[PDB]
Amino acid sequence: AREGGGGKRKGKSKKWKEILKFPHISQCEDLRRTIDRDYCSLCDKQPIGRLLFRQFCETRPGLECYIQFLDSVAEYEVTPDEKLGEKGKKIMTKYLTPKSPVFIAQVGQDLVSQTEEKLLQKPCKELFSACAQSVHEYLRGEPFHEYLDSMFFDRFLQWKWLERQPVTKNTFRQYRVLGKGGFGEVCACQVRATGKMYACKRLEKKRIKKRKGESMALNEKQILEKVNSQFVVNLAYAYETKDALCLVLTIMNGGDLKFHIYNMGNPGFEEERALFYAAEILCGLEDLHHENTVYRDLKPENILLDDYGHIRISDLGLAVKIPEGDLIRGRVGTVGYMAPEVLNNQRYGLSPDYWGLGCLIYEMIEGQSPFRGRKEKVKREEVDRRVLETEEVYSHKFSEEAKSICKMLLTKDAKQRLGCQEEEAAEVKRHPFFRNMNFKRLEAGMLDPPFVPDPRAVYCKDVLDIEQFSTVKGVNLDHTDDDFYSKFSTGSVSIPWQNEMIETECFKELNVFGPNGTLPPDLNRNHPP
């Protein structure tokens, strides 16, 4: 239900209930037939699917206890460390003990035992994770199968129908230019029906073509799609115009980290501020790494702020999804920001992102790159040489803990680098530099940023065309470009679209059923259109 955006001069279109009008359920037969009935996707990962399955569960006493447990576990994870024994024991009594009325029997008895014991010792935020998966293992059975036959899944099919409607020229309205670079420019845009504000990243087809950037543009879209993170820009819509390809991303107008680091006039800022940014970047990094995707482009300009002062990683073009167990090569990135193992063309994993985190913390505190000056005339090959053969030094601006984490992230050997061990990100989160940071609360948006930005305002002439247009394809014998345009423009992206519907409360308002125990007319089979 909560606001956020580039400022909104115009709200929901007042015909929006017509625009988003449910199809009659009889028009959903094709969806019903083709849809992959997959529990995690339909009942968890997809935000409206999860809401509707939860609505189904609350009609059944036997199912609802499982949902309540899952919610309690969510509460447990954000509980302060010193109260975890209390919260954990309450969940034990309430849920995992047979005498309780809200007892859930499908969590295995030896799982309960293991959990009891882990709780007896020092409790960790992840205490109930095994019980949680056990619960989902049960819900994806008969409960799922009953949900699929309910009116709440019928209603999911109706939402999916709306989700998949084409993007057209009437989908969006256009506001000012936000910025310029890369293949194109970025402007504010707004979905008319829902009123949600986004950033439209406009890549010029001519510039993609001359630079041979098709693969990079396609890679960007496809990684964006598959990562859903509070700390990485999300992709809501991907579509075509006559001259451009458009990515409708999370609007982050707070300015980028390059600006904020060098705006002070005394570059570098408070460690408390640096710490907060670093912690969120790390979460963003862990979310990418969960997809076994390495970002490989970490630099201050690719980190953007929102009007709230939270950050997101942007510009995923150089990111690569690595096959499980594989390693990749290739020397990509920005000068001064590339890790030794990238520079030496070795095979590498997630490791460069951690080196990149080191650069960012360093530059945030010192105000300068570790291996370069900002005003400096120096050749690329010299900056590279510094990165391989010299060690950075640390001024009085660094606390001991800051110097330590930077040195451990800026470890040149990737094997010994912080966060590159078996613990992965967890090793970095537990570092003394972060000792006061509860990352679970951070991931849940429960901690306030120490700094609120002036939202960026650029002056720019351009009214640039972001109106959707599907060009006629195949005009030339060579249709490679055209194939790439068709591949790219898949329209709305499921999860962000659904969250948009929820956040703007289009979901809450539109999602309604009959007066009491009845179907609404759009679900009434006896009266088709």
Ligand X SMILES: NC(=O)c1cn([C@@H]2O[C@H](CO)[C@@H](O)[C@H]2O)c2ncnc(N)c12
Query: Which residue numbers belong to the known binding site for ATP?
Result: 178-186, 201
Query: Nearest 5 degrees, angle CA 412-CA 413-CA 415?
Result: 140
In the complex, minimum distance from the CB of residue 302 to ligand X, in angstroms, rounded to a whole number: 8
Torsion of CA 62, 64, 65, 71, to 10 degrees: 160
Query: Nearest 5 degrees, angle CA 210-CA 214-CA 218?
Result: 155
In the complex, minimum distance from the CB of residue 314 to ligand X, in angstroms, rounded to a whole number: 4
Interface of this chain with ligand X, residues 476 to 495, rule: CB under 6 A: none
Interface of this chain with ligand X, residues 265 to 304, rule: CB under 6 A: 304
CA 489 – CA 241 distance, rounded (Å)? 10
Which residue is at the shortest CB distance from ligand X? 179
Candidate list 50, 196, 201, 205; residue touching ligand X; CB under 6 A: 201
Site size toward ligand X (CB under 6 A) is 17
Is the distance from CB of 288 to CB of 225 less than 8 angstroms?
no
* Binding pattern for the stretch 409-438 against ligand X, x by CB under 6 A and - elsewhere: ------------------------------
Based on the shown chain and the rule CB under 6 A, indicate whether residue 166 belongs to the binding site for ligand X.
no
Q: How far apart are the first and last CA of the chain?
A: 32
Q: Which helix (H) or strand (E) holds 87?
A: helix 84-94
In the complex, minimum distance from the CB of residue 239 to ligand X, in angstroms, rounded to a whole number: 16
Candidate list 43, 51, 107, 233; residue touching ligand X; CB under 6 A: 233
Based on the shown chain and the rule CB under 6 A, indicate whether residue 315 belongs to the binding site for ligand X.
yes
Question: 262 CB contacts (<8 Å, ≥6 apart)?
Answer: 367, 374
Considering the complex, state which of residue 92 and residue 304 has its C-beta at the smaller distance from ligand X: 304
Active site residue 297: yes
Candidate list 48, 131, 167, 178; residue touching ligand X; CB under 6 A: 178
Please tell me what DSSP assigns to residue 232: B
Select which of 297, 306, 315, 353 is catalytic.
297
Helix axes 129-139, 109-120, angle to 10 degrees: 160
* Helix ranges (DSSP H) in 380-438: 380-389, 400-409, 425-429
Based on the shown chain and the rule CB under 6 A, indicate whether residue 25 belongs to the binding site for ligand X.
no
DSSP 260-292: HHHHSSS-S--HHHHHHHHHHHHHHHHHHHHTT
Based on the shown chain and the rule CB under 6 A, indicate whether residue 199 belongs to the binding site for ligand X.
yes
Based on the shown chain and the rule CB under 6 A, indicate whether residue 309 belongs to the binding site for ligand X.
no
Based on the shown chain and the rule CB under 6 A, indicate whether residue 197 belongs to the binding site for ligand X.
no
In the complex, minimum distance from the CB of residue 252 to ligand X, in angstroms, rounded to a whole number: 4
Is the distance from CB of 508 to CB of 12 less than 8 angstroms?
no
Based on the shown chain and the rule CB under 6 A, indicate whether residue 190 belongs to the binding site for ligand X.
no
| Segment interacting with ligand X (CB under 6 A) among 153-161, 174-182, 385-393, 476-484 | 174-182
Based on the shown chain and the rule CB under 6 A, indicate whether residue 179 belongs to the binding site for ligand X.
yes
CA 338 – CA 343 distance, rounded (Å)? 7
In the complex, minimum distance from the CB of residue 129 to ligand X, in angstroms, rounded to a whole number: 32
Q: Which amino acid, one-letter code, is at 275? A: L
Contacting positions for ligand X (CB under 6 A)? 178-179, 181, 186, 199, 201, 233, 249-253, 256, 304, 314-315, 456
Residues designated as active site? 297
